[PDB]
């Protein structure tokens, strides 16, 4: 995978170039940044179980069939893996902040998932609607004025939104 | 490719886990060193060609027989002076990018993976490259952490052929 600085880098090489100074003011201010980035990581990070556990929540009482035998979130094993899949999305989500680039999720996300959950009869609609929960609640505690210095995050908050809104789409 | 960035993602997906503070703390590093990295690679882009030039010379110069010994391994032959320079360029190129992601990764990648089979196939000696690469050094007139950071990585390729 690649992080923003190694997508750069790959794409001067393949021109055989050195980088202009441009591109290296975008850099700069890109580690500028830095202090920011590291802050929605470590939240979004630091509130992982209940970002995951409220959105399955809303998830099943929106959609109960999931849940009734016969659902796909039915028995206790098919419970576990769900909750893993939402788990295992919003821990790619957080690699994909702290790269700066969607690529993390390509390579993982692009195995074939809305494949797999096909043919597994896994209803990827109804992820779709649970990666979206998680989406408004990590971007909320994300963006909590409250403990931290105060200054603006929203070119950040539209990236985290990017990927959640990636990963949403590939589940269908 | 390999980053510090990417690395930590790596140890991370591996163990199964959310990043923690110890990856955190591994990005803050490189962060916090990047100001150092980023000057010293715009002041070598911008003297580039000066630096490509004046060390394929220092090269002719301690080694003379690579200017005058016929055959296609020497810079005895416009063809041959013009891919010794353009050699040099890429070890100066890679530095660069080295510097601007914050590790080998580019120079891992792009030109270690390989050397050995290429220099002794087409009959490269390895000290030519490390007299270019030690007049680089003490050529590019950098000072404080922006040397450190330009001398660490072109140490290293020094050392990838001693
Ligand atoms: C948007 C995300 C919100 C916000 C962010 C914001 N944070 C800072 C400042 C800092 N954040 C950190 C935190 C870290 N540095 C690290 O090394 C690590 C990982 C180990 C973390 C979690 C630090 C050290 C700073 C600087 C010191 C400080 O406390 O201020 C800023 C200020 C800009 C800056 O880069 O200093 C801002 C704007 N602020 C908001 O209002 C948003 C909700
Ligand atoms: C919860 C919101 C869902 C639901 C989930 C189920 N997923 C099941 C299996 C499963 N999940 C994946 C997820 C996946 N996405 C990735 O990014 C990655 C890699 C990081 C993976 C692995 C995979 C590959 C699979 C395959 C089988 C497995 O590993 O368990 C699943 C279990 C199906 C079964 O065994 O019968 C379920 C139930 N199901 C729901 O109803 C909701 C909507
Ligand atoms: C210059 C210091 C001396 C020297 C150079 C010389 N090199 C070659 C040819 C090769 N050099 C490379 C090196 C690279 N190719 C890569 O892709 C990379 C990484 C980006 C590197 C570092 C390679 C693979 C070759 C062979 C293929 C090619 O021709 O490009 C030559 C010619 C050798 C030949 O047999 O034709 C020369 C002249 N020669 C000197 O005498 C200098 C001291």
Redesign the interface.
């Known amino acids: 995978?690649?992080?923003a600085?190694?997508k750069?880098?790959?794409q001067?090489?393949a021109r055989?170039e050195?980088?202009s100074?441009t591109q290296?003011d975008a850099?700069?201010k890109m580690?500028s940044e830095?202090?920011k980035r590291?802050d929605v990581?470590?939240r979004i990070?630091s509130n992982?179980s209940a970002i995951v556990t409220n959105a399955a929540r809303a998830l099943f009482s929106e959609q109960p069939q999931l849940i009734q035998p016969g659902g796909n979130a039915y028995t206790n094993r098919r419970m576990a893996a769900c909750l893993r899949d939402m788990e295992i999305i919003?821990?790619y989500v957080?690699?994909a902040i702290?790269?700066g680039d969607s690529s993390?999720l390509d390579d993982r996300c692009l195995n074939g998932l809305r494949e797999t959950y096909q043919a597994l009869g896994v209803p990827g609609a109804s992820v779709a609607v649970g990666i979206e929960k998680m989406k408004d609640s990590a971007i909320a505690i994300a963006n909590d004025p409250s403990g931290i210095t105060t200054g603006d995050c929203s070119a950040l908050m539209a990236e985290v939104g990017t990927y959640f809104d990636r990963a949403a789409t590939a589940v269908q | 490719?390999k980053?510090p960035?990417?690395e930590?993602?790596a140890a991370?997906?591996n163990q199964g886990?959310?990043?923690?503070?110890t990856?955190?703390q591994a990005?803050?590093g490189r962060?916090q060193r990047?100001?150092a990295s980023?000057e010293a690679?715009?002041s070598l882009?911008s003297n580039?060609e000066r630096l490509i030039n004046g060390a394929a010379q220092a090269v002719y110069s301690k080694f003379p027989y690579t200017s005058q010994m016929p055959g296609p391994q020497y810079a005895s032959s416009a063809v041959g002076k013009a891919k010794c320079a353009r050699d040099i360029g890429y070890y100066l190129?890679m530095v660069?990018?080295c510097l601007?992601?914050?590790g080998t990764?580019?120079m891992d990648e792009?030109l270690i993976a390989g050397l050995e089979e290429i220099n002794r196939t087409f009959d490269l000696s390895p000290s030519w490259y490390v007299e270019a690469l030690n007049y680089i050094k003490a050529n590019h007139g950098l000072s404080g952490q922006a040397a450190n950071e330009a001398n660490t990585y072109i140490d290293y390729a020094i050392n990838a052929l001693s």
């Open positions: 995978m690649l992080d600085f190694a750069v880098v790959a001067a090489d055989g050195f980088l100074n290296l850099l700069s580690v830095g202090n590291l990581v470590n990070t992982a919003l821990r957080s690699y702290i790269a993390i | 490719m980053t960035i990417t930590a993602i991370a997906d886990r959310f990043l923690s503070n990856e955190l990005v803050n962060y990047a100001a980023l690679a715009r882009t580039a190129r660069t990018y601007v992601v914050g990764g580019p792009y």
